[PDB]
Every structure is written in structure tokens, then in C-alpha cells.
Symmetry: D2
Subunit: 334 residues, 4 copies
């Protein structure tokens, strides 16, 4: 119902497409800018080493893909401005290329005729960034460019918000043991980040995370109260956040968990979740929630220091939110 | 000079042997109880997917291995009591089989004629446990059974001790992102631990760690001040400890680091170390220190909450300490 | 309709259970001998790092598992003879423990009261071994113990049979690049096979394969015409067979492929398959056929030397056949 | 003694540098064109997830690296022509960038002032390609551009040559189970090769190999007698070639092996080798020979069909040859 165009048909680009494919009554993905090609587009959409073979009749239309029924125009141009958004009448552009995350760069879409742009990552500075289930209500239809934050910020914010509300977060540090991603090197090669420059499947790669300071955007009350690092490890998808926060009200794990289970059943039903099962990474693959609290691990040391371990499917979960946020955009005029 | 016998020729058993091989003027490894066989013993000692091919003339003596020069008797019997310790006159038994870690079980060696037993892990209860560079001086030659703690406890204790001395640890939680180990399953199989039961190279496996409470043994002042969890990840060796502790004296990362660098150059020269290099796992393989602080990551949030990230080669580093502790045993009579 | 009992609830044991769960109108799995426990049984059946979370209401019945509806008695005893087969009235025992593959060992089930025993592997000598789609018709209901061959023999036989029929296999060698399996070591440890003794996820492990000589059992005409090796590589499931055979009638790849496609649509519809898609391992996960020919790779060098590359999901595909063979057992009398 | 410049400081670029570092009395590497930077250059040269930390005092000279002693000018420009070869007086350019493999592209170095260019791969058509230990003697100092073939062609040629000489290769097919390389994707992304486009550490990736037809270049007698495919698997370095060839003279494995051992000790001492040890991948890391025959696996089926399995360290072994070939260039005139 809302004309959507996907710029960047990579991990999230393709996940997004598959995430709503199934969604019940969304917007309308009508175009795809895959630097690759029509061939590459349908092949990589039908086959996924992580998502599995796409259960859908994904074919080629001579010059655009076609899923069980629909034809999606496929275009290729790495210069956003030369894109048909205007001519086709694109309303929303899911900017998942990871190169146009600043007002300027993302603005290229706008000038190609696109109406809004939804950056599938952290916006660069002057950009409104929302996390569904935390601050999505502050969204204005007058927002020309949006940021759906990072995968880590989406997993972290929700239970943080709950933690702050019910116990009063004084300050804390989080560490994310995160799967490797396209940004890393398969084998020791050139990367701005000399740590990321190292073979991804062979090492545990320390690296900076913004998610900590990013939580403050979606939850102003935590401004300057958090910070952390990321540890990239030998797994394709599904990551885990390890949050240690010193709170205001004395507490115990069981109590913290219960708090998560209210919110999980209430204001975050669909965003936050609480698992009491002895699961591991894989078990969380293809989960639609932004964050799943691993109850069995919650620890409160010293009546004020709370440790929380939450899981997240950085690809699918996040793509689900991108779909969600887009839906909102749709519900708020254009 | 001190007759040593290795019970359990596995990862640490073989690492230990190779660790002192090179040591300059030790004790004397004269026997090896490898449930396997003479063949298996020299082959797995010469070839190591993690340590690399052993740079030494490792052969077979018909019924015992032989390294560049020496002949080590090889025996096989999973019932410690039926071992020749007595007859051969074994003084110290490096108990690295991981099954005899309680006073009773480890005691089997004693009754086979062995004098002392050095458990290559956490002792089970009634066992003196020492960490070189922390409490090794409390060692008594009247100690019939010793525990060299866990790999994680050895990496953690040293910088914790420093942290406590210089800033006063009030309480904290540590999380160890640790390589997989023989205890885990290659593919989903039976394990007491349903999380460890899952494929090791495919998931991030949450699991209980004792190291937290264990620090209290070697550093009494931290009794009941710590606790944490372990996260097993897809890497063969080299792990990392993520310690978050709330201290007494306000501080800043640079200051914490400096503190580590005094100790590193003083009382812990050889145990603790501080790296300012943007390294990753692999880079720490084959390091002789128990713990290397990753300076670039030290974070102090809220003037009292300190986050420390230290690396450790769970196989080699620990084996080095086992060699060290054995040497001590040697220096204290028998 | 046919009382089935699963001895050994491991990779195939669990796959088998899940393979028929879905089958349309089979036999009846009423018991499971899982050395583990009821807990371990349902947990490892519900969660699978390779198969994915089981889409079924898998619970615990106090002392037996329960799937979306059904209750399956769970028993534990590693001594087949002490099993209730008799008392419960077990007709068929899916021997997937991998330890009772000889007439004697497998015979234990019989003497516990079980009627037939279907070894989920290669039988040890004096055992009828059948491969569905090749020699299953030679099955006699008077067969007290069956062997469903290896996973590799099931992938190889079908297209070999076709190759022999249409071109006349003179002699050849096959090489299977196979995923690692429970039989291998996670890290350098003791194994009868010093190559398998090496870390599975770190090396390419050459190992002996019987599949070559095994084809001769199910296809007598190939007796002494084949032989090969196996190369275990860093992947959980899905393997590939590389068969090079010198034939009688001169040919060309496209012709060989057509031959496979002919049979694929006829006598082997459901056993053999031919993919023209540029797929890779993962893409073949959860395929019900015993063998999928990778058309794009077929090569005929010298008008008589034919190279074939076929894929197989060693866990699922094979389990599907085990279900199939059991069904047969069910159709020919009791 | 011969002014050498390295264009492309990647896997081979860095391996080459380290390969001769140790060589005894070579040529003289005086410059490095690393699109990266001086920083990146020394860091990635000192640290290697595969090669290990470089045992050498590798520092920064403000604007060029410096190894234990020496200063190597470091330059960055992806347009070969704008390189100082002329001004510095570069004699040989080790073209290891993998983008200038055709006469035209590689010719850019020449026109920047470089004398010869040694492509670290397969040359594109009109280029003399030599394999040390096979056809290096046909080298002319009037050769303006050289190709040191592929890593696979270097492993294959030597034992093929021997096979041809002693038994008469009629025709055959080879399959190489090769480690992943920079050319593959860490995660499903865009690649010309839709198979290589798939996650490297997750799948077994079939891919086309030239090595088969390439052998014909260095061994004219095999023109049109060979062909094969490659199967990229989840390992960083060290690959294996599986050659099946039908010969002229009837033979047996032990005889074939002896033939290899004969040459291994003679004309190929240093190029070919024969291992009787039950080793696996890792064990062959850092081997200086182009090819190591795995004796234990040699198979002769049908008195004429010979199967050979040889190992090769695609990074180090090949780099050793590149050093070797360069040395030759150095010995035949300028
Ligand atoms: O943080 C990331 C980032 O902001 C973004 C993309 O991440 P992804 O994980 O999908 O990575 P990728 O697989 O490399 O996808 C990037 C694609 O962009 C295409 N591309 C680059 N430049 C263009 C231009 N100019 N025009 C069209 N397409 C373009 C690339 O194509 P090529 O491969 O041909 O270079 C890639 O296809 O999403 C963020 N992210 C957020 C949450 C979760 C998450 C994850 N992977 O877990 C990533
Ligand atoms: O926490 C561990 C544990 O306490 C111990 C051993 O750990 P390791 O990592 O070496 O494991 P492994 O490779 O499985 O070695 C165990 C060997 O014991 C042999 N064995 C078992 N039972 C016997 C008996 N009864 N008699 C003789 N030998 C025996 C096993 O042989 P098999 O494989 O034939 O079963 C194994 O060979 O060390 C601790 N540890 C501490 C620090 C660091 C560390 C690491 N790996 O990082 C482990
Ligand atoms: N994996 C695959 O790809 C295929 C395997 N096979 C064959 O199937 C067999 C098993 O292989 P797989 O499932 O892969 O391996 P697993 O080790 O995963 O399964 C073997 C099971 O046997 C169980 N077990 C052992 N002894 C007993 C006993 N005495 N009583 C009850 N349970 C017992 C083991 O329990 P525990 O773990 O408690 O020791 C384990 O669960 C082998 O014959 C194998 O060659 C055939 C085709 C495919
Ligand atoms: N790896 C192996 O096993 C073997 C590889 N080879 C061959 O060697 C070549 C390179 O392979 P490999 O080292 O493996 O791969 P890498 O990608 O690791 O190396 C290629 C290098 O070329 C650099 N580069 C690209 N363009 C330029 C340029 N125009 N100017 C300066 N530097 C440039 C790249 O820099 P950047 O990363 O900044 O883009 C990269 O560092 C290929 O021909 C390959 O087939 C041969 C034998 C073995």
C-alpha cells in the first residue's frame, strides 16, 4: 500500500524482503537496487546459508525478480541519485547498503525522487533514530530520514528501558559477543579496523560498539550512563548482549526476571521475551523479537549490580523491526 | 631432578610435557599414563592442530615414547591404583586426566606409590588450591594433593589481586568468552550440561564457571564479592575474561592500566602482562603469561565501575603455570 | 502399525524419529533407549543445531517423552538384552547406536524379545544389507537382522547402478568429501584412527571408507570394480561423493546427465535427483533423496572416463531411507 | 642484489616477503605498494592468523616499514603506472595484487619503469608461465612478464610430470579440495561466481579450476589430457589435490609411491615430497615444497587407473616458489 524500494540487497536487504514477504498486510516492495544483478538477486534470495532456501517461487522476469506471484523491478546503480524513485514514485527507501548513513549520503535517495529514507543502521549525526518498543511513538511524519539504530541497540534498549523504569539504572557497561558480519575479513586483509582486519572465523575480534551511547538516543534518561565493547566471534548469525548495570533499588535475579516477564507480556509483547530454556545461539535463529532475556543467567551481585544476558538474531530480528518501523512510517501518512 | 609422572596425556598433559621440555632446568618427567597407547602418545605429541608440529625428535621405544634424546616410560591403565608410581618411585603426579579431582580419586595415585599429586584443575573441596603469582607462597611441602585452579581462575586472579590492592574491589561480575574444549560436543549429543551438549563450533554456549568463586580461594579478601558465567565460542584455544568490578577509590582507565603495568613489571613479571596492541585471539597463542591485559579496552564508568578485558591461552599459559607450580613443589622438599 | 523401538537416540536416532514423525502413515515408534535420560531425550529432540527447533509439542511424561500428541516410552540401558522389547512386544528395533553392528551384538535385541533389528549402518559381515532403490526387493521377511548400509553407500549406489546399466562400469575410484561426525574428535584426542583423532573443525581428515566395496553388496556386478577414500571436512552435515569411473560405452557429460535425469524421473524418483542449480552444501540440507547429482559438474574425459559429483545429507537423507527400509520391513509381513 | 618491488601486500604479498626474509642470499625487496598504509602494512606483516606472529622487529619508519634491520619503502597507488619503479630503479615487480594478470594490466608496471613483472598467479593468455621443478629451465631473460601459475598448478604439475614420465598418462581428472581464499565471501554476498558468493566457512563450494588445463602449459605432453574441478572448504590454508589418471603401464600403488620417492630425492628434491605419516591439513602448514604426496592414500584400481592425493600449503608453499622463480629471474641476467 506504501511504495517501498530496497537499496542494497545484502544481508538485511534480503532478510527484510523475506521478513515482510510473510508479514500479513504491509507496504509494497516494488523495486530493488542490487549492485549485483537480476540473476544474483533471485539466486541469493532463494538460497541462504543462514536463512535456508526461500520457501517461495523465486524466478527471473528478464530484468527483475519475481516471488511466488509478484514481480519486483530490479535496478543497479551505486549512485543513489540516478535511481528511478521519482519516476516510479517511491515513497520509502529501505537504505540497507550501509554506505549512505549520513544525512548527505542518504539524501541522495530523496533527490532521486524518493520521499522518505529508512536507514537500516545507525544514522550519522543529524538523524532521528527510533527503536520500536522504546521511542517509536516520537516519530513524526515530517521526518525525511530515519535510523532504525543498530542490531545491538535494538536488543539492548528494550530490557534496559525496563531495567531503568523498575530499578533505576545509575550506570553500567555492556559487552556484546556478536557474530561476524560482512564488515569483517574472511582472511587477514585490509580494514580500517586492524582488529576487524583479522580472519573472522579464526579469532575473537574486539571492536568498538556504539550501541551503548546509542541507547541514550532512544532512552534519554541513560545519557552518559553506559558504554561497552563488542567481541566478534566465529558464528554467522545470532548474537548476545552482556549487560552489567548498577541500579538504584536493591534487587535479586528472580525479581529482575519477573520484571522482564511483565513487560514481555505487556508493553513489549513482541519486542522483549524471556527464555527459561537452556538454549544456545542456533536455537534463537529466526526469532521475531528484538531481544530474548536468558532468565537462567540473570545475576544480581551486591544487591545493586545486575547482570543480564539477552539473545538476538542480528539479521532476522532486526529486519523484523525494520519492517515494523516501515509499517509505522506507513501508518503516519507517507 | 624431581621424578614426575603425567597421568592423562590430553591437551594439558601434552602441553605440559612440551611446556617444560623447553623450560631450562626443571624436574624429570619419567612416565606417562596415556589410556591411548605408545603410538597414539608420540603421534599426538609430535602433531598438534593448535600447538603445531613438535620441533623435536619424537619417536617410539617399543613401549614408551622418546623425545629429542630422552625415553619416557609409557603406561596405560585407567585405574590410578594399578600404576607403578611406587615401584618407579614417582614423586609428583601431574593429574591432568580431569576425572580424579577430588581428594578420594586423586588419592589413588598416592596409594599406587606416588608422593604428591598436582591436579591440573580445580580440586574438589578438601584440596589446597594455589595460583602462581597470587598465593603460591602459602604452599606447604606437607600438602599431599594440590590444585592449580582452572585456566580462567589463573587469568583472572592476578589482575584481580592488583585491582583489589590498589583500588579496593567492593564486588563485581566477570564473563569469560572461552574457546571450546574436550568437554563440549562436536555435534548435538549427550552431556550432563544440556548447553555443552550442543555442537561446539556452531553455537555460543552459555555455561557455569567456578573461576569467580575460585578467586576467593587464592584471594580471601574477595570471598563472596564475585561471580560470573562462561560463554564457549567457536575457537580452539585462547580465551578472554571480561571483568566488571565496582571499586573503592575513584579511577580512570589510564590509571588502572598503569597499575597493571607496575605489577606486570614487578611482582607479576611473567604472570601478568599489558598489551597496547590491537591484537585478536590468535595473536595470544603460545604466550607464557597467565594473563595479558588488553589496555586499549580498559573502561571506567561512573568513577568506580571498572571493566577489564584480559586474554589467556587456556592450554599453553595454564600448562606453563602447572610447570611452574610443579617446580615450586620441587623447591619445597619433595 | 508396526511396533518400532529406537535403540540409540543420537544423530540418526533423533533424525529418524523426526523423519517419520512427518512421514504420512508408517509403523509405530513406541520406545526409545537413550543412555541419556528422558530430559536429555526431549531437549535434544526439540533443539537441533543442524535440524533446527523441532516444530512439535515435545514434552516430558514423567518418564518418557511426548510429541505433539503421543507418548513414547523412554528407557535407558546400554545392555540391549536387558531391554523390554519382549515385554512391550517390539517388532522392529532401529539399531542406531553404532556399537551393535555385528550379528552377535545386534542379536542382543532379538534375545531381549525384539523380532527384527535394522542396523542404521553397515552390518558386520554375516548381515543382509539393502539400499532402497537398488536392491531392497531382495529383502526377505525371514531376515532377522538388516543393514541399511552407510550414508555414503546410499548416495553412491543409485547413480552408480544407473551408470553401470547404461554405460558399463569397468572400474573406478570414488572420493567422498564428508562432513565431520560424532566419530571424530573436537580437539586432538584418542581415537583408533590417528587421523580422526585430530580436531574435526580444524583439518581436512583423510579416512578410510567402506562405501566403495559396499556398493558391490547392493550391486553384485561392481564387485571388485571400485574403491576410494573419504576426506572429512569442517561442516556439520551434507556431504559430497566424487566418483570417477571408466565405462564401456563412449559418452559425454550431457548424455550422462540425461541418463540420470531419466532414472531420476522413473525407477529412482525419490532416491536419485539431478540439480542444475549452482548450489553449495547448505542448500542440500534436509533433502529427502539419497543422492542429488550436480549436473553442472559432470565431466567425461577421454570418451570413457566419467566424473560424477553427487550431494547427500548424511543425516536426514539417510534417516529418510532408514524410515523407508523400515516401512518395507513393515510391508513384507511382520 | 636484484631490486624487487612487491605490488599487492596481501596473503601472497606478505607470505612472499616472509618467505625470503628467511631465504639465505636472494634479491632485494626495496618497496611495497600496499593500497592500505604503512601502519596496516607492518601490523598485518607482524601478525598473521595463519602464519603466526612474525619473528622479527617489524616497525614503522614514518613512511615505510622496517624489519629486523631493514627499511622498505612503502607506497600506495592502485594505478601501477603512477608507481616509482622507474625512479627507484625497480628490476622485478612481484605482481601479487591479483588484478593485473593480463599482458596489458601487468604491463603498467613496466611503463612505470619496472623491468620485469612476475605475476603471482596464472597469466592471462599471452604470458609465459613457468612452474619451478617442471619447466623453469625454459625461462628466457627476454621474458618481460612471467606467471608462476596457480597454487594448485604448482602442487599438481610435479607429481604429474613424474607420473607421465614413468607410466604414461593417457588422460585423467583431478579434484582439488581447497581452503577458502580472499576471493570468497564471508557471508552470502555478490560474487561473479554464484557459488563463491556463498558463505565460505559454512559450505563446501564447488568452483572452476584452471590448474587442469594449466598443467599442459608447463607439461606440453598433457595437452588436452586433463581436467577437473575445485571444492572450496572451511579451512584457512593448506589444500589437497585428488588426481585420478589412467596410465599406459600397468602398476600398483607401492610402485607409484616409490617412483615419487625416487624423484622426490632427485630432480624434485625440494619441490615434491612423500609423506608416509597419517597427517592432516594443519600438519602441512608452513611446508616449503610445492607438493607432498600422501603415500598412505595412493591407489591403483584396474592396473591402470592411479589415484594420487597430494597436499599443498597454497600460501607458503606457493610463496616459496615465487621466491624461487624470482631468484631464477635474478640468476639469468638482470
Ligand atoms: O551495519 C549494517 C549496515 O549498515 C547495513 C548493511 O549490512 P549487511 O549486514 O546487510 O551487509 P552486506 O551484506 O554487505 O550488505 C551491504 C550491501 O550494500 C550493497 N551496496 C553497496 N553499495 C551499494 C550501492 N552504492 N548501491 C547499491 N547497492 C550497494 C552491497 O552490494 P555488494 O556486495 O555488490 O558490494 C551489499 O550487498 O545494515 C546494517 N545491519 C543492521 C542490522 C543487522 C545487520 C546484520 N547483518 O546482522 C546489519
Ligand atoms: O578442566 C580440565 C580437566 O581437569 C583437565 C583435562 O583437560 P584437557 O583439556 O586436557 O582434556 P582432554 O584433552 O580430554 O584430556 C583428558 C585426558 O584424560 C585422559 N584419561 C581419562 N581417564 C583416564 C584415565 N583414567 N587414565 C588415564 N588417562 C585418562 C583422557 O584419555 P582419553 O581421551 O583416552 O579418554 C584424555 O586424554 O585439565 C583441565 N584444564 C585446565 C586448564 C586448561 C585446560 C584447556 N584445555 O584449556 C584444561
Ligand atoms: N551421522 C550420520 O551422518 C550417519 C550415521 N550413521 C551410523 O549410525 C550409527 C550412529 O551414528 P550417529 O547417530 O551418527 O552417532 P551418535 O554418537 O550421535 O549416536 C550413537 C548413539 O548410540 C548411543 N548409545 C551408545 N551405546 C548405547 C547403548 N549401549 N545403549 C543405548 N544407547 C547407546 C550413544 O549414546 P551416548 O552418546 O550416551 O554414548 C549415542 O547417543 C553409526 O552406526 C553411524 O555410522 C549412518 C548414517 C549417517
Ligand atoms: N592465497 C593463496 O592461497 C594464493 C593466491 N594466489 C594469487 O595471488 C593473487 C592475490 O591473491 P591473495 O594474496 O591470495 O589475495 P588478497 O586479496 O589477500 O591480495 C590481493 C591484494 O591486492 C591488493 N591490491 C588490489 N589492487 C591493488 C592495486 N591496484 N594496487 C595496490 N594493491 C592492490 C589488495 O589490496 P586491498 O585489500 O586494499 O583491496 C590486496 O591486498 C591472486 O592472483 C591469487 O589467485 C596465488 C597462489 C596462492
Amino acid at each position: 500500500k506504501l511504495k517501498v524500494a530496497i537499496n542494497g540487497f545484502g544481508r538485511i536487504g534480503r532478510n527484510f524482503l523475506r521478513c515482510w514477504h510473510g508479514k500479513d498486510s504491509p507496504l509494497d516492495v516494488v523495486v530493488i537496487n542490487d549492485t549485483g544483478g537480476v540473476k544474483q538477486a533471485s539466486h541469493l534470495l532463494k538460497y541462504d546459508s543462514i536463512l535456508g532456501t526461500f520457501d517461495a517461487d523465486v524466478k527471473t522476469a528478464g530484468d527483475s525478480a519475481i516471488s511466488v506471484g509478484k514481480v519486483i523491478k530490479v535496478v543497479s546503480d551505486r549512485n543513489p541519485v540516478n535511481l528511478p524513485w521519482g519516476d516510479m514514485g517511491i515513497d520509502l527507501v529501505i537504505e540497507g547498503t550501509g554506505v549512505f548513513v549520513d544525512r548527505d549520503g542518504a539524501g541522495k535517495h530523496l533527490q532521486a525522487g524518493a520521499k522518505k529514507v529508512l536507514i537500516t543502521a545507525p544514522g550519522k549525526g543529524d538523524i532521528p533514530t527510533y527503536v520500536v518498543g522504546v521511542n517509536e511513538e516520537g516519530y513524526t511524519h515530517a521526518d525525511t530520514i530515519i535510523s532504525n539504530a543498530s542490531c545491538t541497540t535494538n536488543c539492548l534498549a528494550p530490557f534496559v528501558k525496563v531495567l531503568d523504569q523498575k530499578f533505576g539504572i545509575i550506570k553500567g557497561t555492556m559487552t556484546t559477543t556478536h557474530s561476524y558480519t560482512g564488515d569483517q575479513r574472511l582472511l587477514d586483509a585490509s580494514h580500517r579496523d586492524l582488529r576487524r582486519a583479522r580472519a573472522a572465523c579464526l579469532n575473537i575480534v574486539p571492536t568498538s560498539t556504539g550501541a551503548a551511547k546509542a541507547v541514550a538516543l532512544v532512552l534519554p534518561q541513560l545519557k552518559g550512563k553506559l558504554n561497552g565493547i563488542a567481541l566478534r566471534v566465529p558464528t554467522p548469525n545470532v548474537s548476545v548482549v552482556d549487560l552489567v548495570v548498577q541500579v538504584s533499588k536493591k534487587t535479586f535475579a528472580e525479581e529482575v526476571n519477573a520484571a522482564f516477564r511483565e513487560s514481555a507480556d505487556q508493553e513489549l509483547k513482541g519486542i522483549l521475551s524471556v527464555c527459561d530454556e537452556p538454549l544456545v545461539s542456533i536455537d534463537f535463529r529466526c526469532t521475531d523479537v528484538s531481544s530474548t532475556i536468558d532468565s537462567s543467567l540473570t545475576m544480581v551481585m551486591g544487591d545493586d549490580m545486575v547482570k543480564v544476558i539477552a539473545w538476538y538474531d542480528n539479521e532476522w530480528g532486526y529486519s523484523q523491526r525494520v519492517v515494523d518501523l516501515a509499517d509505522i512510517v506507513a501508518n503516519k501518512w507517507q
